[PDB]
């Protein structure tokens, strides 16, 4: 009992690739400009006398690097998964991307916890003490992101295959299955599950607490608080669900068919594009809304 599927040549999807290239360049320009302005405003504001919260500066830096290292992916993608650059460039580029992306994702959760504590606990602590605490946690999260990225970056080396070339990760022969699935799971549990759970719980508690206080409700709003979670979910869900679905396919839990392969490839690419849009939308949600920020920008 044998089967012989002769998969036909993939249709001329290059139009899809060109379309995705247009989206990436738009994100590149928008994200670079927006995040740079936030950093500039934040650093300047200190002279006036504002209390510029350190998480915002660190988060802006992380997103700036991510959106600044997109063009390499565009060059690779325009050639349909090929790679014309050197190996050292591949290692360095991936390392930068992973560190910054995980840094940004973790900083969202840290911001949520700090906000809830600020309205509840830190109210009486002196400014110096909370400033020191924020600096310490800022250092720690960078180190954790550094630790997360390293394992896969070290296991990276190109191949030649025909006459094309690729930059594909190499994993131990004796434990290929474990390493691949383990890498992609830590991408989820430490990338989507834990940050999303903490963020959702803490912002719901903030909504309850702010509702209880009579004075706070008038000036603030109860819609932006829920908007945070909704935007994060919509931007970061599709990519992870698609990748998890593909992982199940790799283990042969689903029948294989040409339509399936085409759909997964296009779906994976599209949902990754949305995951970058997250970085573009982050600054507008977290800074541009604040009235003080808008007025501070207006005076400069």
């Amino acid at each position, epitope marked *: 009992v044998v089967d012989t599927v002769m998969c036909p040549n993939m249709p001329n999807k290059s139009v899809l690739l060109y379309t995705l290239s247009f989206i990436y360049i738009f994100i590149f320009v928008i994200g670079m400009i927006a995040n740079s302005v936030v950093v500039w405003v934040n650093i300047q504001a200190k002279t006036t006398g504002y209390d510029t919260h350190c998480y915002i500066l660190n988060l802006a830096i992380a997103d700036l690097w991510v959106v600044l290292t997109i063009p390499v992916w565009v060059v690779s993608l325009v050639q349909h998964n090929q790679w014309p650059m050197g190996e050292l460039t591949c290692k360095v580029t991936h390392l930068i991307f992973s560190i910054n992306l995980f840094g940004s994702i973790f900083f969202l959760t840290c911001m949520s916890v700090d906000r809830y504590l600020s309205i*509840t606990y830190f*109210t*009486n602590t002196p400014s110096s003490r909370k400033k020191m605490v924020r600096r310490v946690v800022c250092i720690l999260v960078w180190l954790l992101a550094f630790c997360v990225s390293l394992p896969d970056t070290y296991y990276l080396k190109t191949v030649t295959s025909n006459n094309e070339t690729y930059c594909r990760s190499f994993y131990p022969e004796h434990s290929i299955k474990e390493w691949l699935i383990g890498m992609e799971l830590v991408s989820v549990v430490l990338g989507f599950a834990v940050p999303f759970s903490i963020i959702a719980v803490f912002y719901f508690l903030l909504a309850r607490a702010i509702s209880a206080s*009579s004075d706070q409700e008038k*000036h*603030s709003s109860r819609k932006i608080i829920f908007s945070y979670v909704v935007v994060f979910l919509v931007c970061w869900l599709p990519y992870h669900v698609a990748v998890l679905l593909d992982i199940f396919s790799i283990l042969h839990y689903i029948p294989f068919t040409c339509r399936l392969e085409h759909a997964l490839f296009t779906a994976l690419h599209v949902t990754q594009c949305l995951s970058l849009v997250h970085c573009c939308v982050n600054p507008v949600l977290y800074s541009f809304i*604040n009235r003080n920020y808008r007025y501070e920008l207006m005076k400069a």
Partner: antibody
Amino acid sequence: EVQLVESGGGLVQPGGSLRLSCAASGFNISSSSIHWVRQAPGKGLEWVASISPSYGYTSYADSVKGRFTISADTSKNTAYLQMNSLRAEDTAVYYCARVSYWDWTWGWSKYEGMDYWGQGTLVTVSS
Amino acid sequence: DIQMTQSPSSLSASVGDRVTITCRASQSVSSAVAWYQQKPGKAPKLLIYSASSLYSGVPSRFSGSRSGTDFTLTISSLQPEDFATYYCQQSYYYPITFGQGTKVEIKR
């Protein structure tokens, strides 16, 4: 609409105890802290203590470290200050002042200060 | 425990005259200052908080400025309604240490 009114006072024999009450109305107390500032006759002000009813975190001024137990009761959005071992150097008037912490400006807030003050009460310990 | 030296202790300026009061800090404080006014035998009010931002409600004559660790309060001109005492503050190192105090009396 924020109004703070103190209560409790009057002369007390040296080496006693006092329990001052600062009832806050018109705004929930959990968000903001509460501070007590002292003013001896014909002299500059000075800080004493501060309490956040949210989780009970407190602080004190070195001059009176250990002699005061500032207490909070979020149930009736009130602040309580208990005095002990009163000496003939605390003769002054006590104002209970709030230090609000807005939330619509979280990431770009300004170092806040005391906003709403009360008339205070007069404490005159004498023998 | 940060000493907040404040000078001059006393002043005397006629109506509608500029006047400036300087408050200093021995250490460095990250622009966390206030400036309270106190009429005789009354609850002190607030004029300027943060470092140079005015507080809603008070006239616009009062304003503040920062320079290293030597803050200063500026008055555009003294109406016959602001003859009282002003206390500076720092809120970046518990305990809070108020300044000595400034008295601005009428001149004749």
